[PDB]
């Protein structure tokens, strides 16, 4: 099992400077040895064998070099310590003892599995103990993806391996928006070159065409004679302006201070990676479902126990249901009601569905519920434990025989009696309620029919005719939002015109909802239409991967749309949702997980966040096995980056352990005592080795070199966040950033913050590409574990309340922006403050962000305004107080309006305020035009576990703020009225 805590010993967060270690010699003798906490295993083994001479049977001991150490780790693993250069305090020992053994077996296989096990947070030897055939078939059959990606990686010279480690950070299109191009002279790049012997850099300025390939850039550099500060490399022939650093330098101004170096300087520093086929790769009369002429029935046998006091609850019963995604294929069927003390039913449940009509993704969703009727006519039902199982296994076999299913706790906030969105399979915690089932037997193994037989029934069932407005109504249906109401008349209309729908491929999601999935006739016909369905935009294919589209060919079409049209920028942009929808997949081996892993193994910047998104949920037992197996396959084939990730992991584990000490053992001690402690362990040797010289998990292109301990401090929160500082070790840290800063917090869930900042960045990309220079600040925020995460620090940023000190006046904020931007820069700081206010005023209203105040709003020196702490979004105040209203979280008080109007009295009547409203209306309608994208992004997070995003009702909040059931003019009227009622007039 994974590690309980992160201390150096069980129940001990930090070993004393000296500690006694019981040493078990191979001759039976036990030697108590005193060791320094940071002593290496080479030293300990040498001292033990010199001391062993003072004990009986020393003649039996071989040479010291013929042995290694073994002990029990806090993961309860029997780890062999082959890397003897490791310190005693870094072994994560359970108890302070060491066993001396001869090393047997494969040293390379055992060392790699140790590093993979450390990276994923659990020993990979636990995967070996899993008897589940799908788990073992997944570990074996996934190496197909692993073998390929390493081949393509080393296929081409040292260039193909450079495309992996340092991929290009480019936009999805070189087509330059109209307002960004007007910032060019019909591009000045300053290239600094480290010329030996001094390796200093000479400033060389060049005015070159924007569409010039990076090679065309070095051509002008040679005729006239890498991004500075981070590890981003222009190694592909993409137009220079398409690179995300260059594209950012045009809009923001400032000079793209790039750098040129020799290929031999970087290609040689690139180590060669090799995938080694593991030790588990070399190990260990049907009927068609359409031939079974009977209805579906499942026998609920009995359950072991339930936790409910009999004085408060009447009876219990097992509620079941046959589900296809989120919808039931038939009416839910309950068992009879029995006492809580006798959880026995032995009862067949008859479902209203023909067995051949069962779709491929048919699932059984069940739960044990308590029914109590002591008050009024209404009786209250409460789910006690739930469980889902796929009626077909990963080999298309219909489930038969008896089955034991350990159930899951009802997640917090879920009020439905069933949990159809929950994961499938049994709870590995066997100290839970266990329900016994029995599926029917049909004289042989029942398999789902082949795709050749599917097209047979479809060609028999199918065995010009359109009107002008009917084609216009089809277009109107496709344009609706994914959560808009579809009537039964509109379902029959869509299904009647399925073949014309191909002319407009974006209607496919609405068409799939019009299919009777409890009927194989319409389902088989739908298969043939999606096989040759033309591909849709990736943003629309992602909807076909959420919880409402479970069919394999539907999801296979979506993956094939991403395989050809999803750019690496967009895949890296939507990776959060793409990882979350893996939880919806029926099986471990699917086309989506293969596409993500294949992309993660060929692109390291994608593979980086692919690792951390999976690693951050390994604590979650509902997905720990799926994400653990997937992380195992990734760490085997990711090459050298496994070493760098382990540097990141061990750096995080020390921050977690340190913050744990401050929140528990040292919580009631003062700030001064906590800081002297805080610096003390930071000056320890092991801490510096692990906490320095590693890539920032917020951005692997950022190198966190040496720590600046004088700028590190404990923040004044109950969870004690750590404000940390590293120097940028790049040869020109002055060009991009010097002194990198990151906030480490261990205690609060940062997934809502991480999601909101992703949406804020996505909104800004919509505005910029449509000619709106609304500058947000979506800083980095990454969840790395259970309520553990990182936060990027915006340099030279200050809160409004910090400004209102150095009590204050309504003009204090305006005067500060003039004192920090005196002279000509004032007219650009006002523009930045104005364009950043419009972006956050529109974004926070749409998303329903938690209320803003003088500490939630921050302003940079150049005037860029931005918000921090997005702990609540959507209708978070709904369940607390049942008010049905849409809040305006960011109310531009008099302080902000004075700044926008350049200090003009009566700010609601200036030309600057009218242009401020014009951008808000442009921003509001722009996001409303892409409303389907944002609905789908929230829809893909429904199974994550975030509290304010559990049902589609939670997503319905943005359907109100965007007023989707109204016209575009009607919605803009709604936005003006909401801005009017919040600012007490002015918006007309």
């Amino acid at each position: 099992p994974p590690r309980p805590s992160s201390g150096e010993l069980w129940g001990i967060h930090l070993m004393p400077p000296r500690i006694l270690v019981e040493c078990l010699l191979p001759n039976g003798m036990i030697v108590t040895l005193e060791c320094l906490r940071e002593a290496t295993l080479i030293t300990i083994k040498h001292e033990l064998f010199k001391e062993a001479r003072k004990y009986p049977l020393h003649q039996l001991l071989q040479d010291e070099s013929s042995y290694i150490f073994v002990s029990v780790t806090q993961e309860a693993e029997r780890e062999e310590f082959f890397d003897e250069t490791r310190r005693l305090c870094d072994l994560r020992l359970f108890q302070p003892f060491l066993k001396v053994i001869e090393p047997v077996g494969n040293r390379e296989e055992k060392i790699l599995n140790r590093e993979i096990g450390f990276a994923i947070g659990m020993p990979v030897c636990e995967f070996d103990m899993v008897k589940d055939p799908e788990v073992q078939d997944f570990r074996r059959n996934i190496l197909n993806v692993c073998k390929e990606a390493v081949d393509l990686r080393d296929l081409n010279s040292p260039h193909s391996r450079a495309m992996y480690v340092y991929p290009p950070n480019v936009e999805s299109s070189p087509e330059l928006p109209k307002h960004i191009y007007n910032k060019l002279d019909k591009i000045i790049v300053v290239i600094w070159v480290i010329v030996s012997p001094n390796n200093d850099k000479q400033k060389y300025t060049l005015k070159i065409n924007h569409d010039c390939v990076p090679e065309q850039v070095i051509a002008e550099a040679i005729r006239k004679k890498k991004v500075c500060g981070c590890d981003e490399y222009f190694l592909e022939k993409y137009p220079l302006s398409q690179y995300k650093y260059i594209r950012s330098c045009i809009m923001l101004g400032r000079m793209p201070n790039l750098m040129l170096m020799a290929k031999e300087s970087l290609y040689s520093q690139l180590p060669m990676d090799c995938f080694t086929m593991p030790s588990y790769s070399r190990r260990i009369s049907t009927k068609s479902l359409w031939v079974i002429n009977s209805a579906l029935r499942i026998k609920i046998l009995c359950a072991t126990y339930v936790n409910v006091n009999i004085r408060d609850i009447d009876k219990i019963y097992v509620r079941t249901g046959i589900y296809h995604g989120g919808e039931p294929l038939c009416d839910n069927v309950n068992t009879q009601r029995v006492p809580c003390s006798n959880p026995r039913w032995n009862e067949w449940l008859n479902y209203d569905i023909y067995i051949p009509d069962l779709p491929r993704a048919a699932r059984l969703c069940l739960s044990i519920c308590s029914v109590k009727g002591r008050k009024g006519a209404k009786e209250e039902h409460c789910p006690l434990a739930w469980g889902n199982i796929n009626l077909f296994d990963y080999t298309d076999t219909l489930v038969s025989g008896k089955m034991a299913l350990n159930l899951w706790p009802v997640p917090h906030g879920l009020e439905d009696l069933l949990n159809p969105i929950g994961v499938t399979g049994s709870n590995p915690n066997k100290e839970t309620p266990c329900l016994e089932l029995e599926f029917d037997w049909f004289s042989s193994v029942v398999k789902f029919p082949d795709m050749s037989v599917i097209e047979e029934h479809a060609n028999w069932s199918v065995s010009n005719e359109l009107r002008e407005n009917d084609k216009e109504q089809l277009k109107a249906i496709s344009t609706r939002d994914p959560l808009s109401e579809i009537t039964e008349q509109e379902k029959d209309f869509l299904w009647s015109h399925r073949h014309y729908c191909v002319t407009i491929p974006e209607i496919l999601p609405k068409l799939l909802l019009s299919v009777k999935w409890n009927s194989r006739d319409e389902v088989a016909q739908m298969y043939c239409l999606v096989k040759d369905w033309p591909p849709i935009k990736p943003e629309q294919a992602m909807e076909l991967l959420d919880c409402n589209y479970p069919d394999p060919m539907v999801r296979g079409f979506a993956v094939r749309c991403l395989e050809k049209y999803l750019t690496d920028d967009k895949l890296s942009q939507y990776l959060i949702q793409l990882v979350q929808v893996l939880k919806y997949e029926q099986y471990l081996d699917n086309l989506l997980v293969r596409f993500l892993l294949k992309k993660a193994l060929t692109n390291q910047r994608i593979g980086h966040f692919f690792f951390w998104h999976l690693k951050s949920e390994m604590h979650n037992k509902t997905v720990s096995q799926r994400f653990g197996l997937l992380l195992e396959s990734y760490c085997r084939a990711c090459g050298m980056y496994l070493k760098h990730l382990n540097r990141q992991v061990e750096a995080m584990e020390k921050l977690i352990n340190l913050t744990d000490i401050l929140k528990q053992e040292k919580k009631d001690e003062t700030q001064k005592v906590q800081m002297k402690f805080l610096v003390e362990q930071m000056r320890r040797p092991d801490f510096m080795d692990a906490l320095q010289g590693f890539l920032s998990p917020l951005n692997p292109a950022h190198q966190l070199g040496n720590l600046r301990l004088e700028e590190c401090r404990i923040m004044s929160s109950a969870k004690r966040p750590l404000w940390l500082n590293w120097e940028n070790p790049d040869i020109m840290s002055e060009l991009l950033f010097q002194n990198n800063e990151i906030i480490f917090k261990n205690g609060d869930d940062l997934r809502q913050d991480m999601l909101t900042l992703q949406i804020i960045r996505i909104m800004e990309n919509i505005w910029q590409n449509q000619g709106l220079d609304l500058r947000m600040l979506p800083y980095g925020c990454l969840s790395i574990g259970d309520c553990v995460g990182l936060i990027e620090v915006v340099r030279n940023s200050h809160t409004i309340m910090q400004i209102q000190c150095k009590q204050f006046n309504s003009h204090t904020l305006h005067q500060w922006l003039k004192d920090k931007n005196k002279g000509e820069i004032y007219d650009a700081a006002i523009d930045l403050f104005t364009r950043s206010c419009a972006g956050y005023c529109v974004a926070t209203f749409i998303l329903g962000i938690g209320d803003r105040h003088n500490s939630n709003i921050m302003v940079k020196d150049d005037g860029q305004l931005f918000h921090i702490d997005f702990g609540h979004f959507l209708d978070h105040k709904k369940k607390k107080f049942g008010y049905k209203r849409e809040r305006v979280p960011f109310v531009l008080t008099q302080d902000f309006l004075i700044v926008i109007s350049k200090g003009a009295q009566e700010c609601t009547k200036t030309r600057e305020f009218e242009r401020f409203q014009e951008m808000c209306y442009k921003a509001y309608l722009a996001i409303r035009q892409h409303a389907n994208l944002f609905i789908n992004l929230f829809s893909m997070m429904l199974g994550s576990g975030m509290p304010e995003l559990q049902s589609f009702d939670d997503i319905a909040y943005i359907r109100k703020t965007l007023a989707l059931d109204k016209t575009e003019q009607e919605a803009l009227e709604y936005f003006m009225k909401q801005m009017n009622d919040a600012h007490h007039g002015g918006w007309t």
Partner: protein, 266 residues
């Protein structure tokens, strides 16, 4: 007949509100509401069929109403009256269902039992205070639920580590017994009795260390035994507060809705 007096008719109720009224209902459960387009001229019949909520638009042209052309009925009630006694399978197959079970605003108002607006506001302030107190009780109890569940998992892991540790130390005994059996015989004839005492002293040293580790696991096992029982009682109080907290929030939201509907609007 009568218009707008229909118990199954509701004004600006949301589909999310219809879902809560049709959740877990039987086939035939229905209600009519204004169309979500808010055009106020069209309505939407919501029918429960096969575990799903089917939305059936009621088109309106001239003075005729119906589900599809031709529109024949004269009142939206007359359309509901007709199918309340006849099946919808004629209008469309895959229905085979009639508008049998009707959600009624009479039993909807059955919660708010106050007359004067002051009594509803006075009662709303009572249920609100009770709901906040019941919620703070549930949130604190859920925190103990999560912490107890997490600590139980840590104890089970440490108990597994104790099992593996005790195995290794017991392997050390069997290893010492194998290597000693012929070496204590070689010292017996050679009269190195003190060397035998050294071997026996280290064996007592080994058995004493094992006896400590076995007792440390036994103390952690009885700790896990108590905490697993504490979790079971926390789990029961969760399943007792949960259903009462829901209806307490529902009663609260019903009084707040009464106050809005009885107050001035638009």
């Amino acid at each position: 007949m009568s218009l707008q007096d229909a118990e199954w008719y509701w004004g600006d109720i949301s589909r999310e509100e219809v879902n809560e009224k049709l959740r877990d209902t039987a086939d035939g459960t229905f209600l009519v509401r204004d169309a979500s387009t808010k055009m106020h001229g069209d309505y939407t019949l919501t029918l429960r069929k096969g575990g799903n909520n089917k939305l059936i638009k009621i088109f309106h042209r001239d003075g005729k109403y119906g589900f599809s052309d031709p529109l024949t009925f004269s009142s939206v009630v007359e359309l509901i009256n007709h199918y309340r006694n006849e099946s919808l399978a004629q209008y469309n197959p895959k229905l085979d269902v009639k508008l049998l079970y009707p959600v009624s605003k009479y039993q909807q108002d059955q919660v708010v039992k106050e007359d004067n607006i002051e009594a509803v506001g006075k009662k709303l302030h009572e249920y609100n205070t009770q709901f906040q107190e019941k919620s703070r009780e549930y949130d604190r109890l859920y925190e103990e639920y999560t912490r107890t569940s997490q600590e139980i998992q840590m104890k089970r892991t440490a108990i597994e580590a104790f099992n593996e540790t005790i195995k290794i130390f017991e392997e050390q005994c069997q290893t010492q017994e194998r290597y000693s059996k012929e070496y204590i015989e070689k010292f017996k004839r050679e009269g190195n009795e003190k060397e035998i005492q050294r071997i026996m002293h280290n064996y007592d040293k080994l058995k004493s260390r094992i006896s400590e580790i076995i007792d440390s696991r036994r103390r952690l096992e009885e700790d896990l035994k108590k905490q697993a029982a504490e979790y079971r009682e926390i789990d029961k109080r969760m399943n007792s507060i949960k259903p009462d907290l829901i209806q307490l929030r529902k009663t609260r939201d019903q009084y707040l809705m009464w106050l809005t509907q009885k107050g001035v609007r638009q």
